Amino acid sequence: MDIDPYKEFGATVELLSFLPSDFFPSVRDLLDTASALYREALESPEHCSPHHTALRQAILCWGELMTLATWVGVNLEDPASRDLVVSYVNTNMGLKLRQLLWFHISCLTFGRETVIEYLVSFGVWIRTPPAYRPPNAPILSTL
Amino acid sequence: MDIDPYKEFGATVELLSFLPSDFFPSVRDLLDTASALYREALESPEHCSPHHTALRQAILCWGELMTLATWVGVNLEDPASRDLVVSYVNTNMGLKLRQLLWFHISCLTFGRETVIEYLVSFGVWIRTPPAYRPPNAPILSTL
Amino acid sequence: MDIDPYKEFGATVELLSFLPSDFFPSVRDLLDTASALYREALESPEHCSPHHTALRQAILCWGELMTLATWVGVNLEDPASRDLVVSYVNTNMGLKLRQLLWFHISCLTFGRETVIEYLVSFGVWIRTPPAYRPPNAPILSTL
Amino acid sequence: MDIDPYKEFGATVELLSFLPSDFFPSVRDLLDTASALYREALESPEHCSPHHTALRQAILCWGELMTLATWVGVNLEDPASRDLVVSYVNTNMGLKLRQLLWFHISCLTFGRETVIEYLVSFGVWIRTPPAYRPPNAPILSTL
């Protein structure tokens, strides 16, 4: 199957490619934001929203990757392989996980429609070449 | 955090640990089933159900894990360590995957409540001594 | 004081005495069933039913007998006596714990009156010599 | 499972640990009290109260510990190991059984609320430094 995780929620993998990969915060920072703002809802037995369901799945996927990294560090004996796998699991997969975390956290905090319009506007800003690019980049905010 | 992926659906990691690990179908079989029965809906841009959202997320997590397996095959030179990582992925993460997929596919097929009652019943059955239980292992059916 | 643990619940040690030893599930299986089916309630601050109260007391009693078994294994350097005590605890006391656990779990699952009628019928069946009874014992089950 | 025997009764293991171990009466004295006051209701086929249910279970747990002690005395011929097991069963497990018996007998006699208030008061008295601790330790009374 060809499943786009954002196709529900009115976005696409291509739209989020407007944002550069180095734009997204670290998984630690994003999980801290999730705990700060939505811990009780995430731990709840309610389907509070599709975003909440998806964020739950993403947090668990990251947790299982961390369990794998620990298991590698304990059960592998070749340090080169140990560290290659650990770094891969921390960086390459972390990128997509923090895309997902960012999208859903931002849509809960600010609104799905607002986030999609931020994506469009930031794509404008970032495609605008530097000579003509304003310094005030689009930024998600309430106030 | 402490997120149980089944409690928003009325179940628990414990309750799915109540069935034996070997009862759960293979990942290949479950993904074939997911495709055959719900590919169009999973690929669609609609929040068809929380089961569908969870299932999309899990299918993509497993896809990234398979991608990890391939990346290891290529960029690892220790065959013992490569085999060890691939086997951890196929077995330990695969079991959690097939529990999750079995649960959500079976919910969509038969009913979430039917599935939870089936878990309880089948666990009690597999624990009852044979001379004092119905002889055939319970099964879900739509016929 | 001469207390019967089932008289409270409409049954009697004499009624459950007709159930053979091979009829009851293991202590581990019964405890896993208790957890899976009624953990939220057993761990709760509510009197949910006399069966729940009794089940809590029985589970904690077994926990203390297991503490005893561990203590024996760690403190007695005479292997014969060590194993003799462990076997007594796991067989003679395990059997009573299994009787009680089965009774209360089955009551919660099926109905106290249903369990009592099942015991009456099972006693009839087991008192009947094999030549003159159906070969399959009566079944208490969800299916 | 992690079951607190007093949660359903408004207390905790933390609150009963306000009392020292050497504060609780002997199992003999507690059983004599239970007989002399509530034998009729404990021997009865009625759920008189959750406390009565729990007391019945405790009484039978102690009966089984006594049976184990007798069986050890008969079936172990290494006096050392016999004595170790008998002492453990009479002392270490006796402690928890007399906590339980004291709690439920005192509840039946005085009120569960009165017993919980007695626990917080004894906490005050025992945490108070000696130079200001009144000789009259708190005590339960009906007058």
**Contact call for A and D: 3+ CB–CB distances under 8 Å:** no
C128-to-A69, A96, C11, C118, C133 alpha-carbon distances in Å: 62, 68, 21, 15, 6
B139-to-B113, B115, B136, C10, C110 alpha-carbon distances in Å: 15, 10, 9, 35, 21
**Euclidean distance between CA atoms C53 and D8, whole angstroms:** 8
Which of A73, A50, A61 has its CA nearest to residue A27?
A61
D130-to-D123, D125, D133 alpha-carbon distances in Å: 13, 9, 5
Q: Which residues contact D109 (CB under 8 A, 6 or more apart)?
A: D37, D140, D142
Could you give the angle at the alpha carbon of A8 between the alpha carbons of A6 and A10, nearest 5°?
A: 75
Asked if B121 lies within 8 A of C137 by C-beta distance, the reply is no
**Euclidean distance between CA atoms C124 and C132, whole angstroms:** 12
Task: Judge residue D64's burial from the number of C-beta atoms within 10 Å of its C-beta, 0-12 exposed, 13-18 middle, 19 or more buried.
Answer: middle
**B33: closest chain A residue by CA:** A1
Radius of gyration of chain B measured on its C-alpha atoms:
17
| A&B contacts, CB < 8 Å | 112
Could you give the angle at the alpha carbon of A75 between the alpha carbons of B100 and B19, nearest 5°?
A: 25
The closest CB to that of D84, out of C50, C53, C76, belongs to C76
Q: Supply A54's token pair.
A: 């998806």
**D9: closest chain C residue by CA:** C45
Q: Supply D143's token pair.
A: 């007058």
Residue D131, classed as helix, strand or coil, is helix
Asked if B129 lies within 8 A of C23 by C-beta distance, the reply is yes
Left, alpha or beta for C140 (phi > 0: left; psi -120 to 50: alpha)? beta
Contacts of C85 in chain D (CB under 8 A): 72, 76, 81, 85
Q: Supply C47's token pair.
A: 């009197």
Task: Judge residue A21's burial from the number of C-beta atoms within 10 Å of its C-beta, 0-12 exposed, 13-18 middle, 19 or more buried.
Answer: exposed
B109-to-B34, D89, D123 alpha-carbon distances in Å: 10, 54, 57
Neighbours of chain C (3+ CB pairs under 8 A): B, D
**Euclidean distance between CA atoms A99 and A58, whole angstroms:** 10
Asked if A45 lies within 8 A of B8 by C-beta distance, the reply is yes
Neighbours of chain D (3+ CB pairs under 8 A): C
Other CB atoms within 10 Å distance of the CB of residue A72: 20
**Euclidean distance between CA atoms C113 and C106, whole angstroms:** 11
Residue A76, classed as helix, strand or coil, is coil
Amino acid at C83: D
**Euclidean distance between CA atoms A50 and B57, whole angstroms:** 11
DSSP C92: I
Q: B41 to chain A, minimum CA–CA distance in Å?
A: 10
Residue pair D25/D102 in contact by the 8 Å Cβ criterion: yes
Q: Supply B69's token pair.
A: 């397996």
Q: C137 to chain D, minimum CA–CA distance in Å?
A: 29
**A100: closest chain B residue by CA:** B57
**Contact call for C and A: 3+ CB–CB distances under 8 Å:** no
Q: D89 to chain C, minimum CA–CA distance in Å?
A: 8
DSSP C131: G
**D85: closest chain C residue by CA:** C72
**Euclidean distance between CA atoms D143 and A66, whole angstroms:** 63
Stated length of chain D: 143
Q: What would the DSSP string read from start to end of B54-123? A: HHHHHHHHHHHHHHHHHHHHHH---HHHHHHHHHHIIIIIHHHHHHHHHHHHHHHHH-HHHHHHHHHHHH
Q: Which residues contact B27 (CB under 8 A, 6 or more apart)?
A: B62, B94, B97, B98, B101
Other CB atoms within 10 Å distance of the CB of residue C105: 21
Asked if B1 lies within 8 A of A76 by C-beta distance, the reply is no
The Cβ-side half-sphere exposure at C3, using a 13 Å CA radius, reads 26
**Euclidean distance between CA atoms D64 and C100, whole angstroms:** 13
B60-91: string of b/e by CB count within 10 Å (b at 16+)? bbbebbeebbebbeeebebeebbebbbebbee
Which of D90, A2, C109, D54 has its CA nearest to residue B127?
C109
Q: Supply A32's token pair.
A: 């801290």
Resolution, angstroms, 1 dp: 2.8
Residue pair B78/A78 in contact by the 8 Å Cβ criterion: yes
Method: cryo-EM
Asked if D1 lies within 8 A of C47 by C-beta distance, the reply is no
Radius of gyration of chain A measured on its C-alpha atoms:
17
Mutate to test the interface with D, among C84, C90, C91, C103 (most CBs of D within 10 A): C84
Intra-chain end-to-end CA distance of chain C, in Å: 40
Left, alpha or beta for A10 (phi > 0: left; psi -120 to 50: alpha)? left
Left, alpha or beta for D111 (phi > 0: left; psi -120 to 50: alpha)? left
**Euclidean distance between CA atoms C100 and C105, whole angstroms:** 8
The closest CB to that of C36, out of B18, B125, B134, belongs to B18
**Contact call for D and C: 3+ CB–CB distances under 8 Å:** yes
Give the torsion sign (CA, D96, D99, D103, D109): positive
Which of D108, D33, C3, A64 has its CA nearest to residue B94?
A64
Radius of gyration of chain C measured on its C-alpha atoms:
17
